[PDB]
Every structure is written in C-alpha cells, then in structure tokens.
Amino acid sequence: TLRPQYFKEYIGQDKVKDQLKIFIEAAKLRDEALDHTLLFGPPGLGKTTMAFVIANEMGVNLKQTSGPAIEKAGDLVAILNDLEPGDILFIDEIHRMPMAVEEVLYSAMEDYYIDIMIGAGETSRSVHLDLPPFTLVGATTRAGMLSNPLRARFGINGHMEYYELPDLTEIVERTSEIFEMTITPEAALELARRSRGTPRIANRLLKRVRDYAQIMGDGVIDDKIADQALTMLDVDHEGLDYVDQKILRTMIEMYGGGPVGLGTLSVNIAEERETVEDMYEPYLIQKGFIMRTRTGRVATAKAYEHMGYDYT
Amino acid sequence: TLRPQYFKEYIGQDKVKDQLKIFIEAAKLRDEALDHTLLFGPPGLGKTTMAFVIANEMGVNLKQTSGPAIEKAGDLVAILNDLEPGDILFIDEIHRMPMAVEEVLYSAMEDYYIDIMIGAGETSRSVHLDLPPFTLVGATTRAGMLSNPLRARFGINGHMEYYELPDLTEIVERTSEIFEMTITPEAALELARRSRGTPRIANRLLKRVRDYAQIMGDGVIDDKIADQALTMLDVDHEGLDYVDQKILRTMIEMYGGGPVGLGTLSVNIAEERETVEDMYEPYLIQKGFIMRTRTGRVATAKAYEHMGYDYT
Amino acid sequence: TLRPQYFKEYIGQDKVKDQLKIFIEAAKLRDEALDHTLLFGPPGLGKTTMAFVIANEMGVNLKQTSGPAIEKAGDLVAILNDLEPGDILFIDEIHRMPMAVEEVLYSAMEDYYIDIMIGAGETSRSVHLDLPPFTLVGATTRAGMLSNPLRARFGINGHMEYYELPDLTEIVERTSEIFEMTITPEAALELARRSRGTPRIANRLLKRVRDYAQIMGDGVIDDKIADQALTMLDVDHEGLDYVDQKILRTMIEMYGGGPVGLGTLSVNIAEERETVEDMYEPYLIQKGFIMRTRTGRVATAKAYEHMGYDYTR
Amino acid sequence: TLRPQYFKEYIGQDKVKDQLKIFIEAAKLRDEALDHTLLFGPPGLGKTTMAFVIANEMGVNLKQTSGPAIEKAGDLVAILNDLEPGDILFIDEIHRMPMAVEEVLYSAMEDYYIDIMITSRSVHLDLPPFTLVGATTRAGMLSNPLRARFGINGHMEYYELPDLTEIVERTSEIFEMTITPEAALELARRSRGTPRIANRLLKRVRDYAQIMGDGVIDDKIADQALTMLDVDHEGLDYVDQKILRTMIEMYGGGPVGLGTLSVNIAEERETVEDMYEPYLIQKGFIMRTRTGRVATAKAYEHMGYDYTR
Amino acid sequence: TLRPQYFKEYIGQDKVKDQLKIFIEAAKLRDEALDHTLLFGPPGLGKTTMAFVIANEMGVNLKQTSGPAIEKAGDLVAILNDLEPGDILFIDEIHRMPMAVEEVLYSAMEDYYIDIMIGAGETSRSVHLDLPPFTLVGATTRAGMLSNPLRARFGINGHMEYYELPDLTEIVERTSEIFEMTITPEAALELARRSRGTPRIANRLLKRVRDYAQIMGDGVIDDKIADQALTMLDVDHEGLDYVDQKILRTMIEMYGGGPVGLGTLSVNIAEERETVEDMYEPYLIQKGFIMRTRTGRVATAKAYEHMGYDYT
Amino acid sequence: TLRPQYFKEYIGQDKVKDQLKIFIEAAKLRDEALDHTLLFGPPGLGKTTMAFVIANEMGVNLKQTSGPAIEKAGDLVAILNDLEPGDILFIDEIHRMPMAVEEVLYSAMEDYYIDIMIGAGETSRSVHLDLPPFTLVGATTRAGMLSNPLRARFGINGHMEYYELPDLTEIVERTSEIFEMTITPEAALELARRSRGTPRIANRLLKRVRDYAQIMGDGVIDDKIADQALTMLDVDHEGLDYVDQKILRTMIEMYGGGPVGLGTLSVNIAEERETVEDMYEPYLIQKGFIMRTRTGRVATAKAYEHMGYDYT
DNA sequence: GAACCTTCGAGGAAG
DNA sequence: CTTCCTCGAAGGTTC
Ligand SMILES: Nc1ncnc2c1ncn2[C@@H]1O[C@H](COP(=O)(O)OP(=O)(O)OP(O)(O)=S)[C@@H](O)[C@H]1O
Ligand SMILES: Nc1ncnc2c1ncn2[C@@H]1O[C@H](COP(=O)(O)OP(=O)(O)OP(O)(O)=S)[C@@H](O)[C@H]1O
Ligand SMILES: Nc1ncnc2c1ncn2[C@@H]1O[C@H](COP(=O)(O)OP(=O)(O)OP(O)(O)=S)[C@@H](O)[C@H]1O
Ligand SMILES: Nc1ncnc2c1ncn2[C@@H]1O[C@H](COP(=O)(O)OP(=O)(O)O)[C@@H](O)[C@H]1O
Ligand SMILES: Nc1ncnc2c1ncn2[C@@H]1O[C@H](COP(=O)(O)OP(=O)(O)O)[C@@H](O)[C@H]1O
Ligand SMILES: [Mg+2]
C-alpha cells in the first residue's frame, strides 16, 4: 500500500512530527493513553495518514467516522461502546457535527462517563456509563469553526502546511518505486511543479501519466512524454485547474477585476461556497493570483498576464 | 437497440472518447479494474449510454441504480454485497443521495472494505467486510454541488459537450434506418439544425415528423414537409422551444429585456428554475441569445431581431 | 352538456388541439395505440375535459382513477388486471404518485409486464405478469417535479394556455344556451373581460348574473342589466375584487408605492398573512401590478395609471 | 335568543345579506339546491350565525360537524352516505381537515359521486343534490382547487355605530334590563365594531348596576361603570393609553423600535405586536415606518398634547 | 399557609380585586356559574394564587391541570365530560396547548357542546356531547400566543401590576410570622425597598437573611443584623446587584456617560451579549438608570447622583 | 485526585464559598433540604467541581444527568420518580432542555407535585404525583437562555469569577504533587501568569511542560527548562499567541496606533472578520492592550512597552 | 467618506 | 409542518 506506516516513512510536516514524537514517547514511559489531539488545515495534505501513524506507534487499533455520520445521541453512544482500552477514534469534519451531539462529548472527553436514558414506558430509566481510556483525534479546516467550550478540551494542536518542491519530488520518486516504473529526475520535478503542492493530486497524475507512457510511449516517463500527457489533461502549465480558470476569467470579464464577494461569485460560477472558500481561494491567495481587500477580492496583475488580458 | 454498444458506433465526444480508450486498454494490459469515473454535463448528451459502452469494452456485467432510490445504509450495503469481481456499479443523480448514505461509499472506494455497526441497546457489534474489486461510475448534471470529499475520490473525469451538425446529421440518418423511414439527405439536415444539439431531442422530433408525413404527405420526408411539420410543432427555425420563447418574450415586454434574475419573477412562468438553470440557460448562452451581467440576464440584439422587436 | 364531447365542441386550444388531431389519425391508420401523453398547465384550463375527448375520438373505453387513490404496488396490479387491449388509462395528479409505485409503472409503460410475488417464506417466488397494449394519459399541474426517467417515457407534450377574449366569449354564449337565457353579444363580452381567462370563472359569473336577471329584471340579460349586476358584485373591469382594489390603493396612498413588508400590509387591510400571499397577491403579480423585492412589494407604473393616480419616478 | 333566526332580525352586513336574498329566492323559483357557499372574515362578525339563517330560509335540516372532528377519510365517507336530497352540510373550521380528506371533496362537490377503494374493490356512490357551507378565518390555508369549487363567497365587514346601537338595545330586552338610548350609544363607541364585544360590555355593566345601583342603566350609572372598567371613550385600554403616552413623552413621537418600546412598558414583545398594535394601526393612531413607528397627529390631539411637525 | 386563601388575606391588586368582588356577588344573586376568566401578566405577581381564591369565594370544587399535560384531543375530551354543574376548571400555562386542541374549546366555551365521532366503519356516527355549566380559568405569561378567536371568548380579563412599598412591607411581616422570627418594622422596610416590587423576591430575601441571623447572630433580625446580612449579599439600597453596579460604573468612567453600544459594553465586563440584554438591562431601564437612544445607551442624571459622581 | 472534594481543598472563590458555607450549616441545624441553587459563569472556572463539593458537605447521594439527555416529558417524569427524601439532583447544561419540558419543573420546584394523564386511553384521568423534598442544582454557561419564570425559582445564585495570580499559583503547585513532579516556586509563577486566570488552561500547560522535561531533561521543572518548553508551545510571557502578536504589531507599524476599523484591520492580517471579533479581541480588551472608541480602536501604552516600541 | 449603531425583511432549518 | 432565528441590506449620525 502507498500509505506510510511510520514516522521514518512520513515525509514533511517536520514541525508537527517534532512535537508528536516528544508527546508520544513520554506517554509510553507511563502506561497511559495520549492526550486528545486536534489537526487542522487544508484538505488532502495527509492528516488522516497521520492518525494511522500515531496508532501504529502506540500499538493500538484505529476507528474512523465523520461528523455528518452522527445524527442522534444513540449513534455516538453505540460507537463509544465498541472501543477497546487505548483505542484511537478519528472524527473527520468534527466542526459539522450537530450541537445536540457535541454536548455529549464534553463528559466523555473530560471524565470518561456518559449519562443516558434507556428503555421505554415504565422501563425508562437513566444509566451512568463508564468508558475505558481512549484518545480522540479531530479534523477540521479552521480553528475558529469550533465552539469555545469544545476547543478548550483538546490538549494538542497541529497546524499542517503545503509541501515544498524538494519534498513533493521525493514523494513522487517514492510512489514511482512502488509501481515498477522508471522516471527521470527532470520529469519528477516537472510533474511535482504541476501538483499544486498537494500529495493527493501528485499520486493521481502519476497514475494517468503511467498509463499514457505504456500505450503511447516506450514505457518510460520522460520530460518529452510527461509534457504531452499533462497537456492532454486540463492541468495548466502551472497547475491551475479548469475550475481555477473559470474563477479568474469570471472576475476579469464579468466583474472587471472586482471588488466582488465570494458569496455572490459562488452563485454566478455555480460552485458551492464552502468549496471555493476551503479548496480554491487558499491556494490562489498564497500564490498572488488573487488579492483581498476590505470590499472583496481583486485579481492581481499577474492574473491578467496569465489569462491573456490587458491590465488596463 | 438505438443506442450504440461500442466505441466504433459512438459518434462525437472525441475528447472524452479518446481518453477512455487509452485508460481502458492500459487497464486490460495490467489485468486490473478501471479507476472510478465521473461523467458530468447537460442532460441527454449520452452519459448513460457511455456507461454501457465501458462495460462492453471491459466485458463485464453492469448494475444500475439511482441516488434517490437508496434511502438507508442497509440498502447500499446489500447492493455492494451483490457484486462480482470487476462489476461496474452505475449511480445516476449521485449528487442527490443522502449524506448518511455517502458515509459508506468513502471507505468502499478508498479501500474496498466496509465496517457496519449492528445491534442496539445491550446489543452493540460491528462487522468488517472485504469487497471484491469494482469500478464505480457516477453521473450528474450539477458538478459544483457534489460534496468535495466525494469528488476527490474519482480518478477519471469527463466533461460532455454539445454535438455539431455533422455528427447530428449522421445520427438523424442512423436513427431513421431503424424506423425504416425514408428521409432525403436534405430533410435530415433540417432536423439537425433545430435539434438544439441534443440527440434525445433529435429523436423526439423525428418520431413525430413520421406521423405527419404519413397523412400530410406520401410517406416521404421532404424538406418542405419536414419544415411544415416543425412549424406545426411550434419549433423555432433556430430550435428555440415554447419555454424559450416564453422567457424572452416576457423579459422584453415586461422588463425591457432585463436585466433580471433567474428566479426573480420566473414564478410568472410555470417552469421550475432548476430546469431553466440546467437545461435552457446554457444553450442560450452558447448561442448568444442571452448574456450574464452583474444584475442578471439581458437579451442581446440577436434576440430582438430574432423575436422581431425593435432594439433599444 | 356542460363538458364538450368532441373536438368540434371543444373551443380553443387550437395548437394542442390540432397536434392531437393528427397523431390520433396516424394511430388509427395502423393497429397501434396512441402514445403516452403528458398534459401541462394551470388549474381549470380543461385538462380533465380533454381526456374524455381523446377517449371518445379514439373510440375506446376509458378507465379512470387518481393519484391519491393509489397507495401501493398492489393497487396498480388490480387495475391493470381490469384493463383491456387498447384501453386508455387516465391518472390525474400523476405527480402525486408515491415513488414506490412510480418505479414499477416504468415496466408497464415501456415493457407491458410487471413482477409478481407468489408463495411465502422458502416458497416465495417471483413471476412476470404480461399486460395488453394500453395508453397512459397523465394530467399534472406541475412538470419539473416529475422524475426524469418518467418524463423520458412520455412521448407527446401539450401545454394548455389561457383562453383569449374571442374564444372565451363564445364559451359564455354556448353556456347561455344550456339554460333558457338570452344574452346580448355586447353583454357576453363584458363577462369574458372579467373572467381572468378561465372557463370555470366565466361560468360562475354567468350563474350569478342569471340569478339577478330573473329576480331584479325581466329575465333577459341585456347590456343595461349586465352593468347593474356587475355593480352589485364589486368586480372591477380588470377583474379586481373589492379587496384587490383596497390593497393597491393602500400601497400608493400610505407608502408611496413601497417597498412595504408583507406583515405591515396585512395589518392595514385587517387580513391574515397567508390570505394575502395566496388568494390576492398571485393574480396581481401576473398582471404586472406589483413586484417582489428583497425589501418588499413595490407598485409598478401600470398600477398607478389603472387606479387613476399620478406617477413619479 | 341571542342568535337571530331570520334575515329580518339580522342587522347589518347589507352587502352580503342583500346578495344571499337574491340567490336564495332565485334558487327556490327553480326548485334547485343552492350553490356551495364559503363564509370567511374576522372573528366574531356573524359567520356561524349566518349559516343557520340560510338553513331556516331554505326550509331544510342542517347537518353539522367540524374540521377537527373529521380525522380520516372513512369519517367523511360515512357522513356523506347519510345525506338526503336538499340537505345542507355545514363544516366549521374547514381549514383543519387533513389533505387526504380535502382531495376526496373535489369530486363530491363537482360531480356528486365518490369512487373509494374498499378483497379490495372499488364502490361507486352517486350522491343526491346537496349544499356544502363552510366557515373559516384562514381562507388562504385552503387548497387552490377547493376554493375554485365554491360558487358564492361571503366576505364579512365590520359594523357601524347605528347598527351596533340597535344590537345593544335588542340584547338589553332579552336580559329584561332597561337602558336609555344615549347610554347605548356610549357602549357602541367602545365596542370596536364587533357584536360580541358590545354584548360583553353590556354584561359587565349589568353586574355593576345590580350591585352598585338600582338595577337600571342610565347615563350616570354607565359613566361610573365604564370608569371602573377604565375603557376610554375611543375604546382604548389602560395599556393602549400607556403606549401612546410613552411614545409622545419619551421619544418625541418616534421613530422607535418594537423591542425598545416593549422593554420600556414591561411587556412581552410578541404581546405588544399581536395584541395591541393591530387596533392602533387600523384607527390611525400609529404608523409603521422603515426606521420604526411614529405617533400621528390624531394621537397628539386625543391624548391632549400640542403637536409639532 | 403561605398562600392566601380569601380576599381578606390577599394584599394589594386593588383594581383586579375590586372587580372580581363585584362580578362574584352578582353571579351569586343570579345563582349561576361565573363567566370565564383570563389572568395574565409578569412572573410572580400572584396569578396562580388568585385562581384558588376565586374557588374559595365561589364555594366550589376546583379541578386542576396544565397545558403541557394535554397533548391530544382525546385527553381534553376526557377531562371535559367529567365536569359537574358549577365546577371550575383551571388550566395553568394554557399557552402551551396545541393549536389543534384550542379549536375544540371554541364550541365548548360558547355553546357548551362538542362534536364527537362514535361507532366504527359503516356504523360510524357523529353525535353532540352536551356539557353542564362550568367556568374556565386560565393563567398565562404570554397572552399574545393565544389565538384571536380564543382570547375573544374570555369574558373577564385580569392584568396584574407591580406592588408598592407599603404593601410589600406588610407581606414581609406576614411571612415573618409563619416562620418563628421576630422582625422590627424598620428592618421590614429595608428589605421591601430592595425586592424590586415582586412578592417572591421579598420572601426570598427574608429566607436568606434568616439563615445569617441564626448562624452569625442571636436568632433575631434587627437593623444591625439586617445591614450586615445585606452587605454579605451585596445588594444596593436601590436593589442593584453586584453586576448592575459594575455596568453603571463602566459607563460613567470610561465612556463619559455614553452613547455606547451593547457589544462594546458587554466585552468590557467579560459578560455575554445575551445575558446583559435579558437579565440586567431590563430593570435598569424600567427604573430610569439607563436610556436607549438611536446612538446607544446613555446614563441618566439619576444614575450619576446614585453612584456619587458629578453630572458635569 | 484532580477535582477537589471538600471546601478545605477548593482554592479561591471566596465570595461563593463564604455564602454556601453559611447556608449549608443553617439547613443542617433545621434538618431541612438546601434551597435550589444555580451556578453560572465563564467556561472552566469550577462550576461542575463545586456541585460535587456541595453534595459531600450536605452528606447525601448525588443523582446526575444532563440537559441534552432529557428529550421529552416522559424522561423527566421517570427521573423524578426515582428521587428519595433529601436527594440532590444535578442537571448539567440545563440551558439545553426544551421549553415544553422546562415548564414541567415550574410546579415541581414550588409545590413538589406534577400533573399527569393516566388510564387505558378509553378512560383516563389527570392525577397528582407527590414528590419528596429534594434540592435541584443547575449549572449553565449562559443563564440568559433560561426563561424568566424558571430563574425566579432558584433561591441561591452563584456567579463565578476569574482567579488571581496568588490563588492560581497554588493550584499549579497542588497539581505537581499529583503528577509527582518537583517544581521550583519560580516556575510555578511563570505558568500561572500565562494561564489567563483559568485553572483548566494552567493544568493543560503543566502537562505539556511535564512531558518535555522528562524526555529531554532530568525530570525537574526548573526556571530554565520551562522557558524552553514554553517557547516550543509558542506562548508569550503575557499569554499572547502569534496571532495576537501579529495583530498588535500591525496596528503599531502600519497605523501608528490607530484608530483603525475592524474591516480594514482584518484584511491586513489575513483573518476572518467575525473570528477576530469573537475569538481574539475579547482578551486583548480586558487586559488593556486595545481600547475601543467611536472612531475605531487604539493600542494603549501597555501594548507599546510589551512590543518594545517607543510610545509618543 | 470611514466607522458604529439600530431597525427591518425575507429565508431556512430544527424541531 | 411549524416556529424560531440569522443573514443581508439601508437609513442615520459623527469625526
Ligand atoms: N374548452 C372548453 N369549452 C367549454 N367548457 C370548458 C372548456 N374547458 C373547460 N371547460 C369547463 O370548465 C370546467 C372545468 O374544466 P376541467 O377540465 O375540469 O378543469 P381542470 O383542469 O380539471 O381543473 P382541475 O382538475 O381542478 S386542475 C368544466 O365545467 C368544463 O366543462
Ligand atoms: N347581526 C347580528 N345581530 C345580532 N347578534 C349578532 C349579529 N352578528 C353576530 N351576533 C352575535 O355575535 C356573537 C358572535 O357571533 P358568531 O357568529 O359566533 O361570530 P363568529 O363568526 O362565529 O366568530 P368565530 O366563529 O369565533 S371566527 C353571537 O352571540 C351572535 O349572536
Ligand atoms: N398578595 C399577596 N399576598 C401574599 N403573598 C402573595 C401575594 N401575591 C403573591 N404572593 C406569594 O408570591 C409567591 C408567588 O406567587 P405566584 O402566585 O406563584 O406567582 P405566579 O403568578 O404563579 O408566577 P408564575 O406562575 O411563575 S408566572 C407565592 O408564594 C404567593 O404566596
Ligand atoms: N507525507 C506523505 N507521504 C507519503 N504519502 C502521502 C503523504 N501525505 C499524503 N500522502 C498520500 O496522499 C493521500 C492522502 O490522503 P489522506 O491522508 O486521506 O489526506 P486527507 O486525510 O487530508 O484527506 C494518500 O494516498 C496518502 O498515501
Ligand atoms: N453519440 C450517440 N450516438 C447514438 N445515440 C445517442 C448518442 N448520444 C445520445 N444518443 C441517444 O439519445 C438518448 C440519450 O439518452 P441518455 O444516454 O440516457 O442521456 P443521459 O444519460 O445523458 O440523460 C438515447 O436514446 C441514445 O440512444
Ligand atoms: Mg403560577
């Protein structure tokens, strides 16, 4: 499998790995579970993979679920009963869980017990459950999304960042070693430069280029071959997606560069507001294609020269 | 049947058709299942037809269902259990299935296994099931509405587009042969012009014109008879339909051509704004009948001269 | 009778009427049943009436039911067992159908057969029930809510439209001959003007004027009596009710045309929110007297010139 | 009895009353059933009373039920089977019937037949000629296809001072209480235009006259009783006067928001908006504005303050 | 007993008490049931207490229930029909009854009958159920929530008002004799002036001071003990709590008396916007310490002279 | 154990403790149940902990449940039937109960009875349930959500306050005994000054510092180790985060101390408009680093010296 | 003309 | 199916 299993295999995120190593080692001298950890940042950067590594280092099983998957208190109660001592519970998009369910975790995380009503009619009665020790791992896009009473109960916080070209190059070379394939260093660098700094995209592109090199080439990935393969896909010469081009083009042609609010833009491009906010705007801002102002977003001169317009 | 069964018979969609060929033959060389594929775009372009073509080229049994047909996780678990190695599962309107159902689809697509909670009260167990390799094929009219974590699982994407007159004329001819109807090469070109670029519409008109020529003619579809029949159907020589004319006419007469929002007073017509946004609006945009503006849609001079109103 | 029985008697709807006429003959020239037809349009335009005309002009027996009366797949089977070759099946409010039945309906429409369960427990078995050729006619007031697969099956589409003065005038004349009442053509036009384009409304107005004409007059509907009757009833020449007129006046006199919120307007006329939004407001929008905006309703220039008040931008 | 029995006894509603007389007399001349009638409008104006009058003029026996009592289609189908030719069915609070029942009523009204599934089989029942009468305060809640099948629509209006004065005098004779003509006018002004409110004040004044007087209502006893009840000569209550007073003396006539005004009088926000403001707006004492509500010149004159534009 | 039982013991409420006396006496001379009565107004002023007094003065048995207990028409139909001639039915929190249930009282209150369904299937029939004469009593804090047709059926309306210092002083002395406690008239007035006009608050203060007087004193309440106890509770001589004093001080010393917004004021005291607007601000306005204006809150001259500052 | 068990162990909250002591003793002398008490205030100050202490001082069994666990009236009625004379009932997060259930407590708290419907449903009647004497304890973070008639029934109100450095330092030392960690008195003061006056934050920081000193140290928290550990966690010596430091620096370097509007400032820091106002600005105002004004907010002299710039 | 504060109106989502 | 409530627009004042 492609997913790393141990910290020695996990490339990048040095600042996070440095802290997690110290807290995991200390928690292993003492015979007790690790404090609840919260990971936040852009999607697709590898925070789920981090949860598996933690479980393998602690030597316990990992269970996985998501906020939207829990709708009533009976769901969360049934899940917690299925945990063994020291197990790790991973909850994705924890910010999207219902408020009536969130207030059930408060007692579970802080004191390991839950008060519940059971039975029906004359049998209806309250019960006091006593849970075994466990570690919760939460995932969310931003810290300001969660309520103050919940955020205060997490003991560890991790912020994850985009990968740099030297890191993605090694990840691409690693992946191209599990597949019995050959890639030249110049090709690996070119393929990485197109991957928007995100490891998930890099794995998807490498698969498609591998197919093209088998049917349309000599079975080896080279700069001349990779250039054509990526040109056949919609990936621009600097990684911009077709959805990215739609946004930039709309701002210049229909809005004249702005200012425009992301809310109004979303309905004009027919994209869900949460996707443009969480997936597309973050990269476009951190790379100078879009600028933010008090009134709204504005396209920079770099965008005009890229899309082929005149920065009048 | 009318719909083609192999790539040799499938007309148009050259971009999509060329990509899938490379990936399909590469997947065979490796003797493995095809990656998950997402087909999206306007209705009636042949999205469903393409799913059958992939199944025949791979040589597998196709299974079919729709988003709204699945109501609880227990249903999808049964379907996923009823799969043979390599089977293709096609889900129409995937964007409409409930969030509670999508929970299971993530784990299946990512690792081919599912964990099902079972029991209630004192009964509280789960079972782990390993699925045989399969290929998921989804189809949607709305892409931007698809949940981001789901959209990231699809490895192959195809954007369907409107057919051009050379292709549509060839389709009109091919379809006429199955009806054993006699149509001249001139009359076949007339229907193509007014089909709005959608094969389903072209087939609808041809089926109706037959009944006209069998009474108002000598069973031969002549250009004059075809043109007289299309005017009887109220089909514009530009292919605008009853709903299309009703939109533009009200905008000009009641709002001086706009600008007006898509739902602002579309209540003054019967059509649900979702169909206007998904099936009527995109055609008019490509044909230059309407342009989008900061304040809504505005009728271009073409519409005025077409509808026969003096432009401002 | 009050309902027409043949295309000769069915006034108006020439576009849809002419199309159906051709398609029916082409089917009669062969041993084939008419294609499944879907009828669209606002309520009361004659959808139900058209179904009987189709059945009579086809020369076929009609079985009638409705969407609310069907609750489970077993109901359709019992009906399908009663149908006969070439019969027409009419289902009003087909959009009403419970989705569980909608899926099985596809096979009958497209394949003329359906699955049937027999036995119980270990003896449970599934078998096909074959069906003779038949034509389904579906009347629906809403189109975009029908599931896409169902819509793909329906072959012919027909849009019903509001009758215009030249045709609605003839319907009044025709109804005036079922009763023993004489009506002057000038009077018949005055009623048609106020019928909002709906045949059912024209008949209701005629019944009320008839009662007055035989109690407060000589039993004849002349232009003089028609004017007095339409004065007891407060229906404006545009067909605005007494309350409709009060709404417009209040907006212009007290708020300078608005914007004004729904709740504020309701308490001025002493009416419920739901009553204004559902009984009076809808027609005023169609005629273009008012518009809905983020800040509330606003009166248009057309409203000012009808009520007789000066207008200012 | 308090409820009038015939049109000659039914004071007011000249518009609705005149139309019904024409349609009822014409229907009799043809020996036909009366068209279906829907009565709607504000509370307490006479909707229920008018339904019984119609039955007495037609000379028929009235069947009575209510929306809340009909819970399932089987209930209505049973009631309909008991109808005889010319019978009148009256359904009060018709807006509460479940939609599963209203959809049955379409054909029963327009075609006089029902087709009900009932080993499952369909029985066709052909109903005799009958008239359905409905009364409701929320006519907008009825389905659009149901409203289209009623042939007569009666919209009720408020009453005038000369009509209410005669009602107060009539009711006083049933209580065998003596009341002077000018004393009756003083109650009519305070009745807000509603017959039920006029009767309620009369009952309270009768209690006062029997305990604090000689059991006779005169221009002197009435003024004392109305002073104890604290009802202004315009029909404003203690809380109504307190609202106007606060707006004029603390905010200079407004504009002021609903929340601020409610908190200043120690009232629940929903109670001020739904229980006091409606009458003040209809009488022209208050106006709603984009920035709040303001007291009009009529309010200054009534409360006794010098207006300043 | 802590709750008064007859009008001789019910202090205050002169307007409501005077009216009810006259209406009760007239009903007895006519020997008939009392008209329906609605009691409404602010919390804790004596609405529930007055309902029992009416029953003792009328000399009849009282049946008691509440809105939250009546959840379906079958319940109400079972409470009715069990009434005997002249009974009094008291429903507390009547505003909670479902609106579909309220509409059953319409004919019961006006005509003393209800329409019920009887029999089954083809034997089903509707019959009138006739009720004996009865008096309905309702109490609510949210009168505006009742339907217009229901409020119009109540024949007597009682709106409660706040008490005055002479009456509250007498109430404290009465309660001080139920418990074994001696209290000086000077001390009784000292508590009354701090009770915000509400009898329940006066009783609460007395209970708290009693605990101190028998633990830190000789078991007697006197001016010396009362002043010390009220200093521990930290209740200003105007009835202002510790948080109330902090609000006024902040407005005078930092903002020069205002205008200031609610958000800015809430953040400076570490409170939250909803508690300040719902718990504390209401009484400060009703007593004239704060004034609300289009620009913000402003402190009045009355506040300056209370806190000891100069109204410069 | 972490949670103090008795008033001798509960450090701080002198004002709350002093009152509770007097009221608890007076109740015991009379041999009566304690009056209903409501605890409210900011998160993590000790509300839950105090509820258990009160139960130990009274010497009675504690019955525990939570607001979100009570879904309907039948649940609450079942709990009340399980009470015994003198029992204490504790409802945490009492603000989450639905209004239809909250109005059942009105009669229970004042008169110890409840109206209930009983019977076969063919025949049924209302009946009183009579409750034994009991003390209801409620805890909530926002009292403003409780209806006015409920709050008026609580006889004892406890408002919690933030801890001072002298008291907060002792809590840090106490916790070091449980973890068996030697801590220098100087190091205890450093952690206390960075804990924002909140005990939960202080305990969280101590656990992180403890893990660091035992993995790369000799198992002693000295003044030198603490500085290194706190630098890794990135907690300023005033408890400010990098975001808080970024805010203050931007106002000083780009605006000369302001005034600046919230919208303009948010853009210059790449933060969300509403997040900054709800998350970070509250603590900056309370400490006096920022001051709000009618024209914007201004950095005070205290913020200048902390950042090292020269004030003018 | 940048920044704060209040009030209203129409959606939508939590029972 | 209904209540509750929250997001967006705009009128008005001050430096
Ligand atoms: N073209 C027509 N000529 C004469 N009478 C007509 C015509 N169209 C409709 N009517 C009459 O109008 C009345 C109502 O017609 P329907 O067909 O029942 O309306 P509808 O579409 O069924 O209304 P619904 O079912 O409530 S949506 C009947 O009395 C018909 O006889
Ligand atoms: N014209 C009238 N003359 C005399 N009494 C009248 C008149 N109209 C109404 N009343 C009396 O007013 C009271 C209320 O009349 P109703 O008919 O019950 O009002 P309503 O329309 O039923 O109000 P609802 O049902 O609550 S919406 C009864 O006592 C009637 O006798
Ligand atoms: N006039 C009075 N004289 C003596 N005690 C009084 C008086 N009015 C009220 N009380 C006491 O005040 C307390 C509260 O009165 P209640 O009648 O319960 O208030 P309330 O109207 O029921 O408040 P709710 O129900 O929460 S809105 C009781 O202990 C009464 O005995
Ligand atoms: N540091 C890394 N080294 C190797 N592979 C990685 C790394 N980070 C991510 N990946 C790969 O990219 C994908 C990341 O998926 P996942 O961890 O689920 O991202 P997320 O959890 O953010 O959705 C996986 O296929 C994973 O193997
Ligand atoms: N390229 C094509 N060649 C032949 N027939 C086509 C083609 N595209 C569409 N059609 C025909 O038009 C219809 C398309 O329907 P379908 O594939 O269901 O559209 P969609 O799935 O996009 O709604 C079918 O009847 C099919 O035979
Ligand atoms: Mg009470």
Numbering used by the authors:
A (entry chain F), B (entry chain E), E (entry chain B), F (entry chain A): 19 to 330
C (entry chain D): 19 to 331
D (entry chain C): 19 to 136, 141 to 331
Quote the paper.
The central and universal element in genetic recombination as well as in double strand break repair and in the process of replication fork rescue is a four-way DNA heteroduplex called the Holliday junction. In prokaryotes, the two proteins RuvA and RuvB play critical roles in the processing of the Holliday junction by promoting the ATP-dependent unidirectional strand-exchange reaction known as active branch migration. In bacteria, the Holliday junction is processed by two homo-hexameric AAA+ ATPase RuvB motors, which assemble together with the RuvA–Holliday junction complex to energize the strand-exchange reaction. Here, using time-resolved cryo-electron microscopy, we obtained structures of the ATP-hydrolysing RuvAB complex in seven distinct conformational states, captured during assembly and processing of a Holliday junction. We show that RuvB motors rotate together with the DNA substrate, which, together with a progressing nucleotide cycle, forms the mechanistic basis for DNA recombination by continuous branch migration.
The first subpopulation contains particles that lack the centrally localized RuvA oligomer (s0−A). These clearly show that the four RuvB subunits A to D are occupied by ATPγS and subunits E and F are occupied by ADP. Notably, specific densities are visible at low density thresholds, indicating the partial presence of ATPγS and Mg2+, thus determining that an asymmetrically formed RuvB hexamer can carry up to five ATP molecules. Because ATP hydrolysis (s2→s3) precedes the acquisition of a new ATP molecule (s4→s5) in the nucleotide cycle, the simultaneous presence of ATP in subunits A and D suggests that state s0 is not part of the hydrolytic cycle. Moreover, we also noticed that the converter in state s0 assumes a hybrid conformation, which is different from any of the conformations seen in the nucleotide cycle (s1 to s5). Therefore, we hypothesized that such a state resembles a RuvB hexamer that has not entered the nucleotide cycle yet and therefore must first undergo ATP hydrolysis or exchange to adopt the position- and conformation-dependent sequence of the nucleotide arrangement as displayed throughout the states s1 to s5. We refer to such a state as the ‘initiation state’ (s0).
